[PDB]
């Protein structure tokens, strides 16, 4: 089960280099180069790093050291081969973030938001992103009254917008992608889940530049199903990215390496992205966790594309299996793929076959017959057949 | 504290008159006729009813049947001054629904849940219902083999499609409501938030016609800000109509009376009702507790409408304090709602103030001063102001 | 992966009994004759049963009823070999019960409770049940005011400190389990989690005689780790019984089949019960859903069986591989399972090394190779070895 | 709602001196010297603070630094009247406790971690401490292989015994109180609730030195009923200390000011520490939002202390009113408190109204009228009453 760059595997420049600080612990590991990322990612087979603006360029650096932050990671990137599909920016940590970028009560704290996000949306685009991530960590509350959620909806939209605005004006390939979290930092996160930032899009000016950023883990912080919100985003030609990781219930947001936690999820989730041919990166948002060395840092990273690609076999086994083909059958799978009422409206109104002469109880007693198919996929995930 | 039909209180016949069935237990209490519940309400001072089909009809009955089941309730209807501004369908109580009404997979059956629906919009606009709910309680799956969630939303979006077509054609004056639910009955249900819902709305062929009913308990058992997501469905223009409850965190759905469980996101949700001027009716779906006989039955619905009475004046003294309206003040909610860049985007890319000379040290080391603001809240809700 | 007798697999007669009535639904399926239950359960190869009272003689028999029912069931244990070694009380379903049976606020309910319990515990011994478990799913509260804890825990500890003189003077064979779970059907169940049983359990006149019965899908209904849950147990020397089936997370009491659910901590359970030797029944207390008819009743049912096994195949696959115990010792299990200070107090406290002269820089920089570890047990767990 | 020393709330140096690190952002408020805080806080009306040991003396500190922290302290301490009721060790900050203080892989880390926690007890005696606080924060693990449980109990049971023939070598009058949490920052740590604290205390050698500290959010995080928790730990006699905040459901470790979160709960709590007469502080763990300045600081602790008082009023005329003592006869609380069979087995076994002759029909029939009662608590709350 060995990684190629064929299969479009990405890691952010902060998941192997998180240093382990937590909200109770000192940093067990010191900083990474970003330069030495990019070669041990590429010697494990990865296809691109992701950025956040912050992470390449130190906050607070001058026009000359941000000059060769970039030029010693372009080095790098030339190099390797590694790609760059996918930037964003980082309105979180700066004390001056505190109650949001985007949607902060002071008006003088948005504006800055808006100036260091399009100063990375140009870098992005030089170093050949075609993604812009945009995750407002900060926007939210712990308390009723200190945030109107429709003057900060108001904001919200105002500022995305805006960008809209930028990149359309200045002739730029790229796409902006929403990335939602229930909770964590705040105590509750505006766009919480998937389907929150799917209908904020609607109102966009510009909805076709948007799409949304979904992560495992976030969804199963409020307990909903990963691979039902995927298919919801993909049905409506929105999935732009993913973020793939593990996550063990609703509790704290875990970042595990992808396979951990929910596993059955995980192989439902492949299952769905090969099935539809979901052809964007396989991205990576993940942290070794802070009992590792380097050693297990790199063991953590290879053992997140080596679970995607078992799970991406037994998947393909199962659909590709003819016990599993009849069973669909058995379950009638084939019949919800058919129009309920193609025949329309007034025909289906005429149709007594569908109403005063439709046997209930014959229909009822029928079994669907989805505990047998069910172990069919547990015996295919776990090798058995 | 006393209601007036003024206050536009409502109640589902299902609510008062549920027997007290549990997964693991019997009815405790006997069945109401529906001519006494509506009596018996409008001694309490509600302004009107909902119902279920078969809560007013029996499954199986004849055409006589329903003649004088309708004849009888308009009667008690047309002595009491009671009104019924919504109805529903029941597409989950019969065997014959087990795996869903618009998205199971038998397309027979799917056939017969429009034609059961489309038979009780009709009874609907007779009895002057202006809003028709759909609340999908067996759409959804305990597996991820059993249910291809985009063909099941292909399905769902058919079935309201059609539903659209047949009001138009008629010329009914009646809107529809989505109720989402993430769970119970099923392992996972279909739409599960609000979000959810309010996206899939605006791929329907005519999205004006819909809008959502959220649950108090349904978000919770999320784990999500129940008045953060109205926000979002006013916002949008979409909240048609709202049930009201209360609910201990994430299990089972409680359905405990309005007030109960989480008391301080019950305040802060008749705040926001209340200001952004909602106009519809305030709906109870709820059910007293199966300790309780018939006295405590009515003793639990007095405290619904009673609890919604004494939050709306704490909240509204809460926002007529002069002290509460500069402390509002101190944390920049007026900033808030004032545009972020009216000045457009040249001139924030011209303003340096923004971004070379924006001093950030000095802005983030400002006080949001959100603690003094929540305490005013509480003060004011427990009324020690 | 053939189930025999000697693998110990017992099976509740409600589990595939379940009629299929949920709080929202009808019953999809018929009642099953426990006659007929013994009979198709001792084909797929189960070890025995387990009954309620009610379940085997339906509540409101007369003496000679009680009479035949119990001897058509023995003469089916007699001509199948299927045992029975556990049995319990029904105190939930019956309205008498609505406040609880050891713990209701009533005295003569409390009593009642206490003679129906007694009666069963009769028919157990006769039958030849080793283990008698409580589930008190009633004990407990919606409301803050409606139940004193301190006193509810004083009834609780004068019930089983009842039964316990009871069997002793009785001189019976049997010990007692008690089965938590943290919510449902009350709002808060009494002696919510398996620690919490524990606890009171050491309060009892005769703690000897009782143990815990815990279930999957309950811990994890509070978000808590079962393995680690049933560890404690084990180490405490009170694992009486054990009741294994899946869950999804925080929700409603799912009772899906062994295996669904949570399929990691499936494995590590497993693991730990055959590491530990675990000699007792492996009781499943499931639910064949609803969708389902008899055909998929009985899939559901061997699928419980089929999943423990190949689980157990692969654990002891995962603690026999010559990598992994080398993994083991890098991780330092060995040092773990070694005194911390066999040399006592007084020279821990004249040992320098364990303080002054430690270099605590040193000590900090090593790796733990938890996550090497973790995927050699992925891979063993899905057969990449 | 003045508070004086007399109501006896304490406060954590780590609580009011948090400087706003969480695991995506920086500090946003500077260092306090723990003088000032004392001085700040006598000012609010607290009786005392507690301290970890690296609170007060920062680690790596020599001798002599050690003895100049400790005396500005006590010169503080004595300026003020301000006791010190409570201290505690911190295994959790450095790096070397990664894996774990009392419960780490590594045997020279355990060994280094019990020695850490003697020095302090020797100073917490030297202060007046009456109670030594033990939160494992870093006991457990976020992988299955990584830690064995049973061996883990082992070590932590070592641990504690260790400690207590420590402190009655020394003749100190000190007691100890473990505090639980179920997750964070470990996926999950040893004892994970109240129970399971309980039940392991009962294991040591000498169980007499032993209680519970439980914290209001950390039974939360796992949903369970905090004040049906602090009843068992009551009724167990093993209440020692208390921590109290607020926390908004199932999520991470909030640590809102007391009040804040579930607000219902906490008028439960304090109506039961007031009427079971707990002589012990009144702690607050909490962490003032990072969103404030100094001011929001001490207006976030004052309010702490002010909604203790609110709700003690509340709870007080709760129990004062005629009308709810009726109210509680008419639910049979008086019923609940009298014993189930003092005429004893033989008795109960002869007496044909507890089964034989008992009326199930009718007692079955009573409404347990919880309702009406639990809208009385409700009025009382909101003050209207
Ligand atoms: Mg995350
Ligand atoms: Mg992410
Ligand atoms: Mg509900
Ligand atoms: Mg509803
Ligand atoms: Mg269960
Ligand atoms: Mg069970
Ligand atoms: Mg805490
Ligand atoms: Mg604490």
């Given at each position: 089960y060995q990684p190629t760059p064929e299969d479009r595997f990405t890691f952010g420049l902060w998941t192997v280099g998180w240093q382990g600080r937590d909200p109770f612990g000192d940093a067990t590991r010191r900083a990474l180069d970003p330069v030495e990322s990019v070669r041990r990612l590429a010697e494990l087979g990865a296809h691109g790093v992701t950025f956040h603006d912050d992470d390449l360029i130190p906050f607070g650096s001058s026009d000359s050291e941000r000059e060769e932050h970039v030029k010693r990671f372009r080095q790098a990137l030339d190099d390797t081969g590694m790609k760059v599909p996918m930037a964003t920016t980082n309105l979180f940590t700066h004390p001056v973030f505190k109650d949001g970028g985007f949607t902060a009560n002071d008006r003088d704290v948005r504006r800055y938001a808006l100036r260091k996000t399009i100063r990375n949306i140009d870098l992005a685009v030089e170093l050949g992103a075609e993604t812009y991530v945009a995750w407002g960590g900060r926007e939210g509350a712990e308390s009723g009254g200190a945030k109107d959620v429709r003057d900060a909806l108001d904001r919200m939209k105002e500022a995305f917008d805006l960008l809209g605005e930028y990149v359309t004006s200045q002739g730029y390939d790229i796409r902006f992608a929403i990335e939602p979290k229930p909770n964590e930092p705040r105590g509750d996160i505006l766009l919480p889940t998937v389907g929150h930032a799917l209908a904020f899009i609607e109102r966009l000016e510009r909805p076709e530049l948007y799409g949304v950023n979904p992560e495992v883990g976030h969804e199963q912080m409020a307990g909903l199903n990963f691979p039902h919100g995927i298919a919801q985003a993909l049905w409506a030609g929105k999935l732009f990215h993913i973020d793939l990781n593990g996550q063990n219930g609703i509790?704290?947001?875990?970042?595990?390496?992808?396979?951990?936690?929910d596993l059955r999820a995980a192989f439902w989730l492949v299952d769905l992205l090969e099935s539809a041919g979901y052809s964007g990166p396989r991205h990576f948002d993940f942290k070794p966790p802070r009992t590792e060395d380097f050693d297990g840092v790199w063991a953590s990273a290879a053992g997140c594309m080596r679970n995607y690609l078992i799970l991406k076999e037994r998947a393909a086994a199962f659909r590709a299996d003819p016990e599993v083909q009849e069973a669909l059958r058995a379950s009638r799978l084939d019949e919800l793929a058919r129009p309920t009422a193609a025949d329309g409206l007034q025909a289906l109104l005429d149709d007594r076959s569908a109403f005063e002469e439709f046997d209930v109880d014959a229909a009822a007693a029928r079994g669907m017959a989805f505990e047998r198919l069910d172990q069919l996929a547990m015996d295919h995930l776990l090798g058995a057949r």
């Open positions: 509790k704290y947001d875990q970042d595990l390496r992808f396979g951990a936690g």
